């Protein structure tokens, strides 16, 4: 209640946390809703909402996709772009693209079918264009 009383408190030191993106160039950054296919129940499940990025390392020129959730900033997608990936439209939805990747959002590699949805068809077309431009430069 009101007034003096003891509470258990754990004091922690400040830490400099690196994002892991310091050495990469932003080729694409737009808001999106990411989905993941759950084969056990045959459903697309929401995977995160935020900015999805196509990043390229300045030095080694490696290209990956990275996305973080809003407000919590946790990773919901983290995978390199390969020449074998096929980014296709999801015909049964609007402004949606589908592809398969070995993703590391949860700390370990998991093969996943992903679907990304953008605000406009225009942004979707720009994502698919930048995605395929990175593939051709492989």
């Amino acid at each position: 209640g009101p007034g003096s009383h003891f509470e258990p408190i754990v004091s922690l030191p400040e830490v400099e946390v690196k994002s892991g993106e310091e050495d990469e160039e932003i080729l694409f950054k737009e808001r999106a809703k990411l989905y993941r296919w759950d084969r056990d129940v045959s459903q697309w499940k929401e995977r995160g909402v935020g900015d999805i990025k196509i990043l390229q390392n300045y030095d080694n020129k490696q290209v990956r996709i990275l996305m973080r959730r809003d407000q919590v900033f946790k990773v919901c997608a983290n995978h390199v772009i390969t020449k074998t990936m096929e980014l296709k439209p999801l015909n049964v939805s609007n402004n949606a693209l589908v592809w398969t990747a070995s993703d590391y959002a949860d700390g370990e590699a998991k093969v996943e079918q992903l679907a990304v949805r953008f605000k406009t068809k225009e942004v979707a077309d720009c994502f698919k264009k930048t995605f395929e431009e990175c593939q051709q430069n492989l």
């Binding site: 509470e7 922690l12 994002s19 892991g20 390392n57 900033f73 390969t82 939805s93 679907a115």
Partner: protein, 206 residues
């Protein structure tokens, strides 16, 4: 590398959205089907802050009497709690005192957040005016929605600031480690192919 662990007990009436709230933080999904929790389900949630990663071990308890399980037995050694109710169901708010009474009986002065869920629904029954229980007990209250994610991170940010004693604590971008180039297993190649074909016939939730 979690600097600290905290046991968080999540309580509230059945159907208020506790399991949906936790799953949203765990996987980012929004589960629409109501499958009642049987007793408890424990899930870890890690948040990265300017003072390191903080892990909450969330004890998501059952709100239905018939599925209560240990009930207050799950509260032992709890360091914080969330009481959830439904702003479209007055009875869930009417029972908030009972949940709070059961929590303090076992844990006493732990930080507790009161959450009114499902504020995305237009036909709101428990108006912001009628919510006065947080004042009568000195709890932190947030309107939240697991469907729209409105304020869905505030209960953990506040509990973190209370347990760590840092009013300026912030959530920060978790390190996004550059992933290695893995060659996919040719054995499961046919399975990945079938899954993709079925997925291309199924539409996104909304």
């Amino acid at each position: 590398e979690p600097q600290v662990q905290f046991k968080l007990v999540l309580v509230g009436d059945g159907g208020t959205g506790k399991t949906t709230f936790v799953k949203r933080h765990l996987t980012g999904e929004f589960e629409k089907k109501y499958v009642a929790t049987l007793g408890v389900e424990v899930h870890p949630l890690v948040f990265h802050t300017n003072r390191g990663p903080i892990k909450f071990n969330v004890w998501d308890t059952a709100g239905q009497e018939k599925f209560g399980g240990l009930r207050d037995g799950y509260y032992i050694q709890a360091q914080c709690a969330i009481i959830m109710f439904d702003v479209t169901s007055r009875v869930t708010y009417k029972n908030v005192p009972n949940w709070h009474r059961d929590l303090v009986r076992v844990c006493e002065n732990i930080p507790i957040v009161l959450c009114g869920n499902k504020v995305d629904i237009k036909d709101r029954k428990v108006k912001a005016k009628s919510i006065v229980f947080h004042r009568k007990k000195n709890l932190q209250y947030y309107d939240i929605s697991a469907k729209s994610n409105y304020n869905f991170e505030k209960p953990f940010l506040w509990l973190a600031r209370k347990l760590i004693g840092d009013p300026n604590l912030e959530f920060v971008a978790m390190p996004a480690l550059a992933p290695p180039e893995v060659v996919m297993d040719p054995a499961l190649a046919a399975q990945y192919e079938h899954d993709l074909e079925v997925a291309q016939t199924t539409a996104l939730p909304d």
